[PDB]
Design a protein around this ligand. Structure first.
Ligand SMILES: Cc1cc2nc3c(=O)[nH]c(=O)nc-3n(C[C@H](O)[C@H](O)[C@H](O)COP(=O)(O)OP(=O)(O)OC[C@H]3O[C@@H](n4cnc5c(N)ncnc54)[C@H](O)[C@@H]3O)c2cc1C
Ligand SMILES: Cc1cc2nc3c(=O)[nH]c(=O)nc-3n(C[C@H](O)[C@H](O)[C@H](O)COP(=O)(O)OP(=O)(O)OC[C@H]3O[C@@H](n4cnc5c(N)ncnc54)[C@H](O)[C@@H]3O)c2cc1C
Lengths: 401, 401
């Protein structure tokens, strides 16, 4: 159960949601949060979206007032922990004792070795600092090269195009968002960005760079004023690895957030956990997971009577005129398409089925359907394939089941 | 003497210089610094200068590595202290014990009540946050109104003009930098800014504002997209006042940084101290004072054998093409002018005399002379009035004496 004092490593969304929930649940004991970034806790989603526009960090801070009497050690790095002695060594020379240790260290952007020593600016996008630097280079008429067709790269592509920047995007895979989205969506998104002026290149890899020019594996080249690398992230599990916990690009935890080390828990982007829909363990790198997992784990720690974490995964993406919401699995037995997939008036819904059962849903500029669909997904609904296809009200079908 | 542990309130230049000096001097005990700003300690001078151009805060951070093993509580506010119990109450619910308490809380910009409720943005310039907000409004062709003809307002005037902003400056006094500079300099500076396109208005006061228009006490009005108020600062001495120390818009301290409360010291912008040149007590709001006073006080705390703080005051200002350096008093018996005071090629030196004794010096785009002049000032030199006037080498005269 809960043993005081509580020490949380990392001051991101997972950590903030966890501590707030502890207090809300009733834990009145000591809570200390260690965050290496010298910044008032903030939200990351805005960084590749609205923030690139207003540059106002005060519009993206997280609400830490819901977590009364918590000491936040900002600008401090947890260098290591001793599971035997139950202590944490900090970069400022101090040591913190703990009853319960929570690792919410997130993940960090993977680097591109071929660009080691590029004569032009090469950035990754994870922190407020990264965002400020990138935002500064988004001048009109400049040439931006984005390596990686994931949601964050595409959101930045859309943002940059709006600022009058010329954007080129290189992806090793034959499609965009190859990991997190259904093929139908990836095809439409590619078409949308192409139509926006984005120079997309699939199945191309960066091999190197010479005098301000990026070289591709197909013997061609691309001159860029700035390069932004977004080819995925790696779990910040170094402390857990050194302390002997089970890790493989992420700390393994069960539904209670427990690691293989007693009194040590983990939450957020840094964890490999069971995907309830696929039954497999994976790292779920979403905003809702960081928040929901932090809450679920805090609740069970205060009350073992509470159930383990069981929320289904979902995320959203804002890419220019596209408001994308994706829940569950990207593929299944069959796919139902509601509405029309038109570049002109994009507004459709995709439903992924697995033997009559809803296992996934995508909504593009159709938020009204997302809520019900998530409910249907939650109960493993198996609705009428026909009713599902023809313009029925999901809110209604959802209500029934 | 020095009693552990040391607790410093405020994480500005004074605090950083003090703690670094403590460690350098040999104090190996505990040191805790409390700073209400959630920012890695940074320098303020760049904010109204270069920073407005590059917006890169990483180019202005202070070096805290010279102060090993210091715990920096950033984003935390010291709410009060108990000189009896020797404790400090923090905003996060924690309490810190202290052997020696140092107040380095600086000062805060004074507000303009007549602009309370202005329909347009009204900012003051003190922090990195203020700087980022102001920098965002510096768009070309916009109209900026600056209230206050002090160095910071003038530095911002120069900066804004360079960004193609239309600048209007209102000052209640008949001259610029009325407090810190010799009249000869203030006249030249006014002429320089006027020639740069700055709309200067002297002996004018702001009486109010209506629908995006600032009203002056002379029945006239000025439409402005943004207003920046820089009419001086007030010492952040609230904690000292509440604890019973002697204060009057600043904490009174002697040459050892001692306040009237045992075991409590104060440094920087927050202190009222003796001006060695005038013999009067005043608040010295300069960069060199924050650094030099912090050092002098740390030294004497570790070694009572060391002398009290005795540096003479000086500061600089970068206003467009003008590199201004001012040391000592702004006025005296007579003034010697070396070089030519031309708007075209500004490069002159002013020497303030008091019965044959050098009591002040101003250098405009003449840094070579500043060093020697400061040395002459340090020894209270009384050189030849003629030699001083005619092109002699100050380095040389300085060497002699
Ligand atoms: C630009 C961007 C846009 C995104 N947009 C979306 C979106 O639209 N929708 C969505 O669902 N998700 C989005 N995400 C993902 C979402 O931001 C993450 O899932 C979420 O931030 C993960 O939270 P976290 O608390 O686990 O970890 P993080 O936010 O990474 O925070 C972990 C913190 O711990 C710190 N830390 C690491 N090691 C140490 C140590 N040893 N000592 C002290 N501190 C340490 C880290 O530096 C960091 O500040 C986006 C992410 C980025 C970067
Ligand atoms: C825009 C600008 C430009 C300048 N340019 C020049 C220049 O060119 N040349 C020059 O000589 N001088 C210049 N100065 C003046 C110089 O910056 C100051 O003299 C110097 O910063 C004073 O240092 P300080 O450490 O005393 O206090 P400060 O820097 O004010 O820092 C005190 C710190 O304590 C914090 N604090 C206050 N109360 C509390 C509390 N209760 N708990 C915790 N923390 C608290 C404050 O918020 C602040 O961060 C400039 C100042 C500004 C604002």
């Amino acid at each position: 159960a809960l043993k005081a004092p509580v020490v949380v490593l990392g001051a991101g969304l997972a950590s903030v949601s966890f501590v707030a929930e502890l207090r809300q649940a009733g834990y009145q004991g000591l809570i200390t949060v260690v965050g290496d970034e010298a910044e008032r806790p903030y939200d990351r989603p805005p960084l590749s979206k609205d923030f690139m526009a207003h540059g106002d960090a005060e519009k993206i801070r997280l609400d830490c007032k819901r977590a009364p009497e918590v000491e936040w050690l900002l600008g401090v790095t947890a260098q290591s922990f001793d599971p035997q002695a139950h202590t944490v060594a900090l970069s400022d020379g101090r040591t913190l004792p703990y009853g319960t240790l929570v690792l919410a260290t997130g993940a960090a952007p993977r680097a591109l070795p071929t660009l080691q020593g590029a004569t032009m600016p090469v950035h990754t996008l994870r922190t407020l600092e990264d965002a400020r630097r990138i935002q500064a280079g988004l001048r009109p008429q400049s040439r931006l090269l984005i390596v990686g067709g994931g949601v964050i790269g595409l959101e930045l592509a859309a943002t940059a195009r709006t600022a009058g920047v010329h954007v080129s995007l290189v992806e090793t895979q034959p499609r965009l968002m190859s990991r997190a989205a259904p093929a139908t969506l990836a095809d439409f998104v590619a078409r949308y960005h192409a139509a926006q002026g984005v120079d997309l290149r699939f199945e191309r890899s960066v091999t190197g760079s010479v005098d301000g020019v990026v070289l591709l594996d197909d013997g061609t080249r691309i001159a860029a004023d700035m390069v932004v690398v977004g080819i995925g992230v790696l779990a910040n599990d170094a402390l857990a690895r050194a302390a002997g916990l089970a890790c493989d690009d992420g700390i393994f935890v069960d539904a209670y957030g427990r690691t293989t080390c007693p009194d040590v828990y983990a939450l957020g982007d840094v964890t490999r956990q069971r995907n309830p829909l696929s039954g497999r363990f994976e790292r779920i790198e979403t905003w809702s997971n960081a928040q929901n997992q932090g809450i679920a784990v805090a609740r069970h720690l205060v009350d073992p009577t509470a159930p383990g974490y069981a929320e289904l995964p979902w995320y959203w993406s804002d890419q220019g005129a596209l408001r994308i919401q994706v829940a569950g699995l990207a593929s299944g037995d069959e796919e139902i398409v509601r509405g029309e997939v038109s570049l002109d008036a994009p507004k459709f819904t995709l439903i992924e089925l697995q033997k009559g059962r809803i296992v996934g849903a995508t909504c593009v500029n159709n938020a009204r359907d997302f809520a019900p669909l998530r409910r249907l997904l939650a109960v493993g609904a198996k609705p009428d394939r026909a009713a599902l296809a023809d313009p029925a009200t999901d809110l209604r079908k959802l209500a029934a089941a």
